[PDB]
């Protein structure tokens, strides 16, 4: 319906070209690292950056230990059409939906994949209390409804539903899922699929009179907190994801 301006499409093309150039280099570097081509690379090892509150940064070497992680969509870059290489990864992880989240388990192979799509999302280690609150106060669950259709992803209304769906691995209540998510249990993958999305509440959701100023303040604070480094060797940036 709306007419497309030349400037907008040109900007989209330029941003897409820049992102594709970055992604190709990132993929080549990751493939070389997987092949142990340490002969000539910027950094043999990898780091994970952390930003905390006045504002200071922290950097630590990557440790080969799995840990529960939560990832949320950041709705950007603003004018970049997601390339198929990253679009497939986002679709598989089902984080394409704006403001949607999902829990994943950190692994040696997962970390390089996160590095490629790190700018597109925000990652971090949520606290146990935050995880429990989110699980007991949010989370979609796909099931077959009464008899016919399966559009009812609203909420974990009844514990008996969890017993019925699985029944075998002892997952009879929400607390079982919470324990299996916090702990490195085998059922983490099973319950992770059971709760594909985590539709966290979005921002102010409007413009209004004061809401416009609030949105502007949020946008300008995002640049002072989040930043598109675009470096192929950019360390993963961790933040206090629990602040929500």
């Amino acid at each position: 319906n709306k007419f497309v301006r030349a400037e907008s499409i040109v900007a989209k093309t330029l941003a897409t070209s820049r992102e594709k150039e970055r992604i190709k280099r990132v993929s080549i570097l990751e493939d070389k690292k997987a092949k142990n081509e340490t002969q000539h690379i910027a950094s043999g090892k990898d780091f994970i950056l952390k930003i905390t509150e006045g504002l200071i940064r922290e950097k630590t070497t990557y440790d080969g230990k799995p840990a529960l992680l939560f990832i949320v969509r950041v709705r950007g870059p603003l004018a970049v059409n997601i390339p198929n290489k990253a679009f497939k990864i986002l679709s598989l992880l089902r984080l394409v939906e704006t403001n949607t989240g999902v829990f994943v388990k950190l692994t040696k192979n997962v970390y390089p994949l996160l590095k490629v799509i790190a700018p597109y999302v925000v990652i971090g280690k949520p606290s146990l209390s935050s995880i429990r609150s989110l699980i007991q106060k949010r989370g979609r669950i796909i099931y077959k409804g009464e008899n016919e259709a399966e559009p009812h992803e609203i909420v974990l209304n009844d514990n008996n539903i969890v017993e019925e769906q699985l029944g075998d691995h002892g997952i009879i209540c929400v607390e079982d899922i919470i324990h299996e998510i916090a702990t490195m249990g085998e059922s983490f993958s099973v319950c992770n699929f059971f709760l594909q999305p985590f539709k966290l509440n979005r921002e102010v959701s409007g413009f209004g009179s004061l809401n416009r100023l609030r949105k502007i303040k949020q946008r300008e604070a995002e640049s002072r907190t989040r930043q598109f480094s675009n470096a192929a060797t950019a360390p993963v940036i961790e933040v206090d994801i629990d602040s929500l």
Binding site: V155, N157, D158
Partner: protein
């Protein structure tokens, strides 16, 4: 009467300005106005009639937060009986066996459940479906709590008295 204008004069662009006023020093140096204002503000700060922003930072983020630190009611032993227009809040009465584990005699039968479901809103004085749940986990989730309490809030002050 109606003919196009002529650019006989505007045709030739001017080469040099029309004035040779010497440039004042203020055009290349900070003017006295800023220094005078700064000195006036310094005098005000010294005289104590104005405060620097450094102390205002504390006054805004380390002061005015001390609120509610006073006895709102204090010593008081009298009621609104002076004016009898203070209608009682009509708080809900105690429960009527609407428990998760009520007596087995109040276990709604399928016919009773169907009859209750047939009745619509505003005619459900018995607004609960009693049932027995020997296990706490078996208790189903309740989503109608918000609606019922919203209706109560509406009826609190949206009814003639």
């Amino acid at each position: 009467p109606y003919e196009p204008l002529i650019d006989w004069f505007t045709r030739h662009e001017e080469v040099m300005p029309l004035t040779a006023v010497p440039e004042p020093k203020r055009r290349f140096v900070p003017s006295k106005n800023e220094a005078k204002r700064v000195m006036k503000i310094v005098r005000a700060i010294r005289e104590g009639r104005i405060i620097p922003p450094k102390k205002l930072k504390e006054m805004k983020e380390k002061e005015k937060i001390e609120n509610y630190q006073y006895d709102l009611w204090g010593d008081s032993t009298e009621t609104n009986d002076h004016v009898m227009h203070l209608r009682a809040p009509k708080l809900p009465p105690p429960t009527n066996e609407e428990s998760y584990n009520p007596p087995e005699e109040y276990l709604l039968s399928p016919e009773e459940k169907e009859a209750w479901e047939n009745t619509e809103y505003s005619e459900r004085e018995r607004n609960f479906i009693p049932q027995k749940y020997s296990a706490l986990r078996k208790v189903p989730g309740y989503g109608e709590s918000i609606r019922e309490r919203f209706e109560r809030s509406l009826d609190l002050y949206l009814a003639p008295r």
